mmCIF file of C-alpha atoms in Angstrom:
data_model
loop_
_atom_site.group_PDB
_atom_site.id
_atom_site.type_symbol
_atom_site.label_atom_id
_atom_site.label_comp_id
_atom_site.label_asym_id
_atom_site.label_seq_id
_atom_site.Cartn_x
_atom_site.Cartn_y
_atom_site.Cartn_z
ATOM 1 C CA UNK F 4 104.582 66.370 118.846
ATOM 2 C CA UNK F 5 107.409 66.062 121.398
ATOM 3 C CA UNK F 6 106.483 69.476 122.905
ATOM 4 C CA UNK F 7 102.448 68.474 123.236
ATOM 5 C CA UNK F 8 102.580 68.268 127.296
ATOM 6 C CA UNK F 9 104.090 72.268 126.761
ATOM 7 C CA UNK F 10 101.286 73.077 124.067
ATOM 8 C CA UNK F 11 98.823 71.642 126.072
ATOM 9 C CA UNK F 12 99.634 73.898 129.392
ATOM 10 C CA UNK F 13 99.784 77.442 127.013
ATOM 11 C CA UNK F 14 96.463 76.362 125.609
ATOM 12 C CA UNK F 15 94.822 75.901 128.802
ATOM 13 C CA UNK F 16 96.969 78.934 130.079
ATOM 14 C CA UNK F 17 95.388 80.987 126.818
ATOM 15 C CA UNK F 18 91.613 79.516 127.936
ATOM 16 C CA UNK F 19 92.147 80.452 131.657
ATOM 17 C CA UNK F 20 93.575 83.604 130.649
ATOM 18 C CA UNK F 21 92.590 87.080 132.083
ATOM 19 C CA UNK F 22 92.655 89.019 128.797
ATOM 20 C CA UNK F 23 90.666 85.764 127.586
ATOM 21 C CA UNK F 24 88.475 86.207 130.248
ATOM 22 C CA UNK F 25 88.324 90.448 128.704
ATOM 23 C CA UNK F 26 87.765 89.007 125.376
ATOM 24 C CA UNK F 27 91.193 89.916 124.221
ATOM 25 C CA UNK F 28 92.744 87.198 122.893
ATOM 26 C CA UNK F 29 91.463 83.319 122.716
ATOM 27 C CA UNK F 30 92.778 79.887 121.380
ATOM 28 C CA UNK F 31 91.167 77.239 119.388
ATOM 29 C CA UNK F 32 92.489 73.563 118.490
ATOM 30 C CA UNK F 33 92.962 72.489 114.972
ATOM 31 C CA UNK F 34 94.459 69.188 114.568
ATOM 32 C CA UNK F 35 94.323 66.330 117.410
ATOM 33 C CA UNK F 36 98.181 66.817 118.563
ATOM 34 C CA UNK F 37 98.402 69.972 119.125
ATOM 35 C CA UNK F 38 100.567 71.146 116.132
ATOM 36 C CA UNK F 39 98.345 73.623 114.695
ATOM 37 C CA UNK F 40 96.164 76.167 116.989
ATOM 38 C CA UNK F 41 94.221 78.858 115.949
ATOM 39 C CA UNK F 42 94.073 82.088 117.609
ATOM 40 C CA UNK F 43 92.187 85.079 117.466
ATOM 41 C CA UNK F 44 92.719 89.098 119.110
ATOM 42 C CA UNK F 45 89.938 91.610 119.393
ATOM 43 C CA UNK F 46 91.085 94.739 117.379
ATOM 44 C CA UNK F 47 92.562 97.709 119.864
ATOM 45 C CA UNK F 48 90.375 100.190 120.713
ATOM 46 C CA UNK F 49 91.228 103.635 118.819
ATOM 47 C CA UNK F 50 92.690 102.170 115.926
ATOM 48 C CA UNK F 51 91.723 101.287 112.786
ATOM 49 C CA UNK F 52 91.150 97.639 113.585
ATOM 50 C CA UNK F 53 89.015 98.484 116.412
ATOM 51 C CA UNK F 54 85.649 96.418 116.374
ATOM 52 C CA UNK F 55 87.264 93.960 114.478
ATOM 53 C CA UNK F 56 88.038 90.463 115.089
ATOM 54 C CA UNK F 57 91.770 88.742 113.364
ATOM 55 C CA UNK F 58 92.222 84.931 113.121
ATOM 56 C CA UNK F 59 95.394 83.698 113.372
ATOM 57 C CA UNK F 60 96.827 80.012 112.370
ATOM 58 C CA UNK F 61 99.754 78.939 115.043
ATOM 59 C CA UNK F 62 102.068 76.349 113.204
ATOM 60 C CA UNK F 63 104.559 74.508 116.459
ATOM 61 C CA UNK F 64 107.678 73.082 113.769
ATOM 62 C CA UNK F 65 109.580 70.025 114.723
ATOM 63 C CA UNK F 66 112.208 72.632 116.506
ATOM 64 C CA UNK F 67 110.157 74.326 118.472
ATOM 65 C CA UNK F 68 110.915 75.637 121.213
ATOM 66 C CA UNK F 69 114.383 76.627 120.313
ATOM 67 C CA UNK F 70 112.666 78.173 117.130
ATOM 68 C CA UNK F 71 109.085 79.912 117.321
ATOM 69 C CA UNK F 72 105.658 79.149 116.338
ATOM 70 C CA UNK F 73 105.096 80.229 112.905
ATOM 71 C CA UNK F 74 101.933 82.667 112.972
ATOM 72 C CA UNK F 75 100.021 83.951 110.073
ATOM 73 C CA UNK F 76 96.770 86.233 110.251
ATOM 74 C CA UNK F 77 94.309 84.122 108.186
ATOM 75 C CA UNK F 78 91.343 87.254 108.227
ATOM 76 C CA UNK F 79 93.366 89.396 105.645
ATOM 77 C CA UNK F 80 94.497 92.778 106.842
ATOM 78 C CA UNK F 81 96.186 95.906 105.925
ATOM 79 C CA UNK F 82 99.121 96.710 108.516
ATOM 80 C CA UNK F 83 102.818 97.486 107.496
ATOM 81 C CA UNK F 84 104.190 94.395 109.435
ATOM 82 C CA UNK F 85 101.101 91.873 108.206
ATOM 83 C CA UNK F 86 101.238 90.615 104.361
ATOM 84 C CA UNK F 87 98.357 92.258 102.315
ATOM 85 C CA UNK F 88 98.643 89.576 100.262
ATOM 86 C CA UNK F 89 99.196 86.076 102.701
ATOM 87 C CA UNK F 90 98.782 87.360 106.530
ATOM 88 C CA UNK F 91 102.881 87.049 106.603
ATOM 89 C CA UNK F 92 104.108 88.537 109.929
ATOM 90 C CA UNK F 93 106.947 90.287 110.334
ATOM 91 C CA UNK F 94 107.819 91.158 114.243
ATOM 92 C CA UNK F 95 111.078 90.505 116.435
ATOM 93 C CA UNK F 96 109.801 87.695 118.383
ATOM 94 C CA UNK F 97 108.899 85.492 116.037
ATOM 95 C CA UNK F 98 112.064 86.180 114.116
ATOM 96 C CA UNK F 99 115.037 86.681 115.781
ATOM 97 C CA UNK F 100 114.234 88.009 119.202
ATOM 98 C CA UNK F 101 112.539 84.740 120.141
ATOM 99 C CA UNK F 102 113.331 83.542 123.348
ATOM 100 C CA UNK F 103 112.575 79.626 124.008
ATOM 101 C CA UNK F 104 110.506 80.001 127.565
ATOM 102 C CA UNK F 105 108.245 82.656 125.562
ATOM 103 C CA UNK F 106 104.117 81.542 125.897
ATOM 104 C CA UNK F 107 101.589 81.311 123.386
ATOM 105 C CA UNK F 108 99.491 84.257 125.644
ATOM 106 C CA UNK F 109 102.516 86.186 125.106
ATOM 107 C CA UNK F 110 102.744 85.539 121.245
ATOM 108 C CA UNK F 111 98.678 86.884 121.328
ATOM 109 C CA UNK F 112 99.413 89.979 123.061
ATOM 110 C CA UNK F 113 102.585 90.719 121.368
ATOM 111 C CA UNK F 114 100.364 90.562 118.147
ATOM 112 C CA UNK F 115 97.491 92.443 119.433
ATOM 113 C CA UNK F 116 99.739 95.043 120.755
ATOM 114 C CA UNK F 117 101.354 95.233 116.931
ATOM 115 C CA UNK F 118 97.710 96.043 115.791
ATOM 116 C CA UNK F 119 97.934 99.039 118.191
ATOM 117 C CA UNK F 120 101.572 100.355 116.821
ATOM 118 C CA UNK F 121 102.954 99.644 113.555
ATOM 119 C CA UNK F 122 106.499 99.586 112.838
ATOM 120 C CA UNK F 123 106.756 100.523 109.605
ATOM 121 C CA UNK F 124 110.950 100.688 109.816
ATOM 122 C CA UNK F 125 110.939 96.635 109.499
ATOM 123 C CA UNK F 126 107.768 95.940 107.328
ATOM 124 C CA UNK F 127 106.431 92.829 106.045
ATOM 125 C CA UNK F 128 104.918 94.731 103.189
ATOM 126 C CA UNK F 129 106.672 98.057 101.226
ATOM 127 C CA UNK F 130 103.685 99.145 99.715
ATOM 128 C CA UNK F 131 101.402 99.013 102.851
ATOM 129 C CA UNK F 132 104.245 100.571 105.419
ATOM 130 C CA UNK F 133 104.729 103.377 102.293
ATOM 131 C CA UNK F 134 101.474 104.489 102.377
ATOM 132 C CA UNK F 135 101.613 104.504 106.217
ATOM 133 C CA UNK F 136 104.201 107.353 105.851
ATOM 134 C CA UNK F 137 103.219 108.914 102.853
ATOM 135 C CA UNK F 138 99.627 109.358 103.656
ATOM 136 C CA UNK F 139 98.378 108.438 106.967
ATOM 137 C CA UNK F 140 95.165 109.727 106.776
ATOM 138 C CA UNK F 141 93.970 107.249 103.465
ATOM 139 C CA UNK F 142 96.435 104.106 105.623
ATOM 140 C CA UNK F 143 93.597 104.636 108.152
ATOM 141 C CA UNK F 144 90.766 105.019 105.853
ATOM 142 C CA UNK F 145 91.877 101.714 104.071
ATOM 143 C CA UNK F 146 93.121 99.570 107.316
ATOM 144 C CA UNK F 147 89.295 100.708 108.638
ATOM 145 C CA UNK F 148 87.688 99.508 105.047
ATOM 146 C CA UNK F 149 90.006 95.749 105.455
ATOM 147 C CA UNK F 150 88.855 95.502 109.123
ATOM 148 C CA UNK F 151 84.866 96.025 107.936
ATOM 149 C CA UNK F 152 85.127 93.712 104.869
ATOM 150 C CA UNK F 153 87.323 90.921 106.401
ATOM 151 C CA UNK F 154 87.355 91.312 110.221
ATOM 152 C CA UNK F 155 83.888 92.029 110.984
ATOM 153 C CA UNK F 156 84.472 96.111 112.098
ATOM 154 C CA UNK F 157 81.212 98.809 111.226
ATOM 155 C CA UNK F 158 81.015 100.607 107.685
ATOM 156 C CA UNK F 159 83.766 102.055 106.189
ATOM 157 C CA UNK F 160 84.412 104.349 103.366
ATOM 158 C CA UNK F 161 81.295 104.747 101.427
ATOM 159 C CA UNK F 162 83.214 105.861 98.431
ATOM 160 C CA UNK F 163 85.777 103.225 98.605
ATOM 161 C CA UNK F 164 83.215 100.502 98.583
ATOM 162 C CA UNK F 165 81.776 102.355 95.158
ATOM 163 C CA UNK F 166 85.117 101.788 93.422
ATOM 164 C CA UNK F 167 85.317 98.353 94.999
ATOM 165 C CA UNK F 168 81.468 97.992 93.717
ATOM 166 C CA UNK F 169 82.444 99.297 90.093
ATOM 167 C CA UNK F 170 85.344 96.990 89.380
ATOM 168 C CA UNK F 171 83.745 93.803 90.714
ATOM 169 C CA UNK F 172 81.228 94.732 88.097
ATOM 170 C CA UNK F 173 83.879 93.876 85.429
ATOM 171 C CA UNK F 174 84.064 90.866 86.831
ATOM 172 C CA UNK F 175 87.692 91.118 88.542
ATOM 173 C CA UNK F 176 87.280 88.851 91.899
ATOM 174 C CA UNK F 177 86.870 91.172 95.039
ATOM 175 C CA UNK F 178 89.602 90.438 96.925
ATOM 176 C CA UNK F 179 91.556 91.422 93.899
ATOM 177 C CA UNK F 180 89.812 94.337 93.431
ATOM 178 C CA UNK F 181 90.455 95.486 97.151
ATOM 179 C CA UNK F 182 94.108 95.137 96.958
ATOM 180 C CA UNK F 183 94.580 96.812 93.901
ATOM 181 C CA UNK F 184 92.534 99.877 94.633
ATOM 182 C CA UNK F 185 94.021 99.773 98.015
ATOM 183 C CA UNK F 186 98.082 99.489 96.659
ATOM 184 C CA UNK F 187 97.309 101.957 94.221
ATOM 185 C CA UNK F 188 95.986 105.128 96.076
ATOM 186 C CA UNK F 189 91.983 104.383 95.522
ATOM 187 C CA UNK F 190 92.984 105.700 91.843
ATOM 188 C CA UNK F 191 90.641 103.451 89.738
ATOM 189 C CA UNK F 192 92.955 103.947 86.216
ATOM 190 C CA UNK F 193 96.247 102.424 87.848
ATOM 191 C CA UNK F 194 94.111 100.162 90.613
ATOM 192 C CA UNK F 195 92.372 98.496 86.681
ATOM 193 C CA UNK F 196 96.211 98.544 84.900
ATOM 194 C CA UNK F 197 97.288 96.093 87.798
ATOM 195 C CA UNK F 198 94.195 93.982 87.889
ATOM 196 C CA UNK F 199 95.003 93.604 84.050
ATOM 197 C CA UNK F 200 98.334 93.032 84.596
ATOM 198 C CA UNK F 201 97.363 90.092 86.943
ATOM 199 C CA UNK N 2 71.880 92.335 68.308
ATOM 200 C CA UNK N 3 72.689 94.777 70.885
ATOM 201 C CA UNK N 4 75.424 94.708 73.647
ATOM 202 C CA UNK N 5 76.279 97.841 75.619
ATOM 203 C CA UNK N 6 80.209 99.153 76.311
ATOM 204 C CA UNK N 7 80.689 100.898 79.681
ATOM 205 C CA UNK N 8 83.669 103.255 80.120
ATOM 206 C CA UNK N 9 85.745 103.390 83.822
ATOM 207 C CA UNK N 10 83.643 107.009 84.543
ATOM 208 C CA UNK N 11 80.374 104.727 83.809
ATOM 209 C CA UNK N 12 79.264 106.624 80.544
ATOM 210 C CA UNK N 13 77.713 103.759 78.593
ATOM 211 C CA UNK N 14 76.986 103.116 74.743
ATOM 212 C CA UNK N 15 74.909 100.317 73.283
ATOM 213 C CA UNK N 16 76.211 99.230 69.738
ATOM 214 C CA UNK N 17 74.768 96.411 67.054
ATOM 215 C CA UNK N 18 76.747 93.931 66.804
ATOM 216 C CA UNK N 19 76.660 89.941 65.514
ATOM 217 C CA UNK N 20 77.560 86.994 67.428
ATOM 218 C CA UNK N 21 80.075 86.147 64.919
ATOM 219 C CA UNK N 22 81.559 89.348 65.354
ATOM 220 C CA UNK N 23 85.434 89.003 66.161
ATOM 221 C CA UNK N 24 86.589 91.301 68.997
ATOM 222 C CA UNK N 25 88.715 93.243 66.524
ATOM 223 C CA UNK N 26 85.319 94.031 64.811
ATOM 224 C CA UNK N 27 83.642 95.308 67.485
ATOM 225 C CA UNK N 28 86.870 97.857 68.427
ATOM 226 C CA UNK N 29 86.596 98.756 64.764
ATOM 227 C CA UNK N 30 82.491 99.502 65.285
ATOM 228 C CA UNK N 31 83.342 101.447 69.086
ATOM 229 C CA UNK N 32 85.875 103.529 66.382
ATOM 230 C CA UNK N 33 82.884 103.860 63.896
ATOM 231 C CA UNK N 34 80.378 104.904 66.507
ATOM 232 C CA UNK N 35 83.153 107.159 69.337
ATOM 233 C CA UNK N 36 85.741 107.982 67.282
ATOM 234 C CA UNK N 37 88.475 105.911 69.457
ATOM 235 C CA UNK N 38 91.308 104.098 67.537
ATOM 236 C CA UNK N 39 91.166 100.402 67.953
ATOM 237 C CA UNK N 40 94.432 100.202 69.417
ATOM 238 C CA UNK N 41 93.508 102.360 72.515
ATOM 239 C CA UNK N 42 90.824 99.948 73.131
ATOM 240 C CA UNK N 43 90.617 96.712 75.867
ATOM 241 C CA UNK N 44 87.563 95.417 76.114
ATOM 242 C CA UNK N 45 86.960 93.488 79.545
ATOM 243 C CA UNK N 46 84.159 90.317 80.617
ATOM 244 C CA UNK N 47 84.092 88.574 83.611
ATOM 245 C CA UNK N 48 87.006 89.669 84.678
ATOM 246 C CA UNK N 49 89.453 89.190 81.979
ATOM 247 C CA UNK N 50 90.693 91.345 78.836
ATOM 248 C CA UNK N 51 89.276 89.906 75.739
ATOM 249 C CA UNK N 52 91.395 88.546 72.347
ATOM 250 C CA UNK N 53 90.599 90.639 69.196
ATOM 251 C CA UNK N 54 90.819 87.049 67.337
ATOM 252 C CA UNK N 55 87.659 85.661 68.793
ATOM 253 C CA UNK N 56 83.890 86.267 68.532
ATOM 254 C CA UNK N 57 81.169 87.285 70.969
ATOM 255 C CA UNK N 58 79.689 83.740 70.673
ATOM 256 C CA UNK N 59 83.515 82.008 71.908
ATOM 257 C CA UNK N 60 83.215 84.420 75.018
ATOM 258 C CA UNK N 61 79.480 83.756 75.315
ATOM 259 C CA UNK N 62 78.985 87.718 75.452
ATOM 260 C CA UNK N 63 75.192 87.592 74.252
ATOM 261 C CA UNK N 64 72.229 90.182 73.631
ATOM 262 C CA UNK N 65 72.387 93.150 76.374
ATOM 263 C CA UNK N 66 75.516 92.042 78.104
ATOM 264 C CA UNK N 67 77.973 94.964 78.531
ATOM 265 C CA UNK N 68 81.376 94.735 77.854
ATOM 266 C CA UNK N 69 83.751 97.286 79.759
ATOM 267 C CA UNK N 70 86.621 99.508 78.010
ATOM 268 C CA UNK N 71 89.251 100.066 79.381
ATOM 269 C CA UNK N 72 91.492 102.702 77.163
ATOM 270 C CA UNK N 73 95.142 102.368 77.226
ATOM 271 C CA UNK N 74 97.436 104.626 79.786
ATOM 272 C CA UNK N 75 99.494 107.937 78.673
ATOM 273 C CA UNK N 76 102.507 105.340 79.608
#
């Protein structure tokens, strides 16, 4: 890791941080040279992630920093820029809007301010960002129901975790089960044709 | 022995059946006993659609287990 002495400032940066110190954001090491981190950002209040807690893994590649970090959310979430699916990101910075003397504190926020406004024009995930226009009201419903079950948030849906309850009974594995309901309206028929499908 | 079939709105059936029964048999008996044609029917366990060619012994589907169906879509 050519760019350790760099990692190693941002990470204490992160630790020493004032949103750290608000239990915002926070940093973790993972491997001995500092090529993999792991992050994690409190939910924003007054959203649907609110009371939830999202890890994230922080890759540095060999060109970094003329290229960004790559960042995935490992807790699985339902956003129109996140993958449903992997924890995929999709956000200017870390695309093409990356800027070299960008800091791993701003990479946090950046995220944790995504969690507080979508932007469902340049999605990560169609089916996610189409229910965010379509129906708002059941994209918060379900984002609230992923940030109890994954991210640690207070109950959810009592009827959603019925269906969820019903189909696990088939056997299908849950996280299965919770995508399928959630990609197909809540409609158990369809949400069952996809989990047969594979 | 007997096995029970639950349907997706939870109504549930219980229907004799034999170990050696093939799946194909026991769409045939759901037909006897409901009235549905066979070829409507899926029949689900742990989590996976079952083949008509094999028995309830191959899938280890014994005494009181319940086997979900799962009828085909309008399409």
């Amino acid at each position: 890791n050519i760019a350790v002495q760099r990692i190693k400032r941002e990470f204490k940066e992160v630790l020493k941080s004032e949103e750290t110190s608000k239990n915002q954001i926070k940093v973790d090491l993972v491997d001995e040279n500092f090529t993999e981190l792991r992050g994690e950002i409190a939910g924003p209040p007054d959203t649907p992630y609110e009371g939830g807690r999202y890890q994230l893994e922080i890759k540095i590649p060999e060109t970094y920093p003329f290229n960004p970090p790559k960042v995935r959310f490992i807790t699985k979430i339902w956003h129109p820029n996140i993958s449903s699916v992997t924890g995929a990101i999709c956000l200017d910075i870390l695309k093409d809007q990356w800027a070299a003397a960008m800091t791993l504190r701003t990479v946090l926020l950046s995220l944790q301010a995504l969690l507080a406004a979508a932007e469902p024009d340049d999605p990560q995930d169609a089916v996610v960002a189409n229910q965010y226009k379509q129906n708002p009201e059941m994209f918060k419903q379900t984002a609230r129901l992923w940030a109890h079950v994954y991210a640690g948030a207070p109950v959810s849906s009592p009827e959603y975790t019925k269906k969820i309850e019903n189909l696990c009974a088939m056997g299908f594995d849950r996280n299965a089960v919770i995508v399928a309901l959630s990609s197909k309206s809540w409609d158990v028929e369809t949400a069952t044709e996809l989990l047969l499908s594979n | 022995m007997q096995i029970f079939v639950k349907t997706l709105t939870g109504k549930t059936i219980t229907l004799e059946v034999e170990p050696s029964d093939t799946i194909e048999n026991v769409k045939a008996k759901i037909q006897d006993k409901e009235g549905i044609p066979p070829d409507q029917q899926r029949l689900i366990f742990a989590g996976k659609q079952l083949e008509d060619g094999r028995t309830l012994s191959d899938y280890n589907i014994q005494k009181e287990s319940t086997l979900h169906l799962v009828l085909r879509l309008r399409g």
